């Protein structure tokens, strides 16, 4: 008897075939232009897609006027539009099966910083997030895999307490100016 919670999940699944030439290269392509650390960040985004795809194909077998299909189909589609992976005019349960991994990986905070001109490369973006140089609205974020909603897209600012933001110089610049 303790006042603890033991509920926890796994956010990835290892593939059955560990060494196949086609899967090794499509994963390496995704690590390349999205600047990921391992294959686990590929398998995690692959796993969150299959959870959505499983929910879509369960509702699709239900008949059209079923009230659980209408409530949870609208709920699922609203969540995908909110994170910006679906267009406004594509709200139907059939368009969900046409998503790919690259649509989810494009919404990370690491990718949005490179796309917004706050960084010089996708790898420069990742080190800039981690070093507390990037904020969203008014909140500093360390997490590169922070999925950016549509309302937070135009509010990705550049950290008033950072050297690149408000203007307090860093440790290196302060030490160097003391030499002269």
């Amino acid at each position: 008897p303790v006042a603890r919670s033991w509920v926890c999940r796994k956010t990835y699944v290892t593939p059955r075939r560990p060494f196949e030439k086609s899967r090794l290269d499509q994963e390496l392509k995704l690590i390349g232009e999205y600047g990921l650390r391992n294959k686990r960040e590929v398998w995690r985004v692959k796993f969150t897609l299959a959870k959505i795809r499983k929910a879509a194909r369960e509702l699709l077998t239900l008949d059209e006027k079923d009230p659980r299909r209408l409530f949870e189909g609208n709920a699922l589609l609203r969540r995908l539009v909110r994170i910006g992976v679906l267009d406004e005019g594509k709200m139907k349960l059939d368009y969900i099966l046409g998503l790919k991994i690259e649509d989810f990986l494009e919404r990370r905070l690491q990718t949005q910083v490179f796309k917004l001109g706050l960084a010089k490369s996708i790898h420069h973006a990742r080190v800039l997030i981690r070093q507390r140089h990037i904020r969203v609205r008014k909140q500093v974020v360390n997490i590169p895999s922070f999925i950016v909603r549509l309302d937070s897209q135009k509010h990705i600012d550049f950290s008033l307490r950072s050297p690149y933001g408000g203007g307090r110089p860093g440790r290196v610049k302060r030490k160097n100016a003391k030499k002269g």
């Binding site: 290269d25 690590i31 650390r37 790898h123």
Partner: peptide
Amino acid sequence: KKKKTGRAKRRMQYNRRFVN
């Protein structure tokens, strides 16, 4: 010399296999 580890090792592997 030493070898890079982590995210930068995957970046170097991606360049040797895909770009060049």
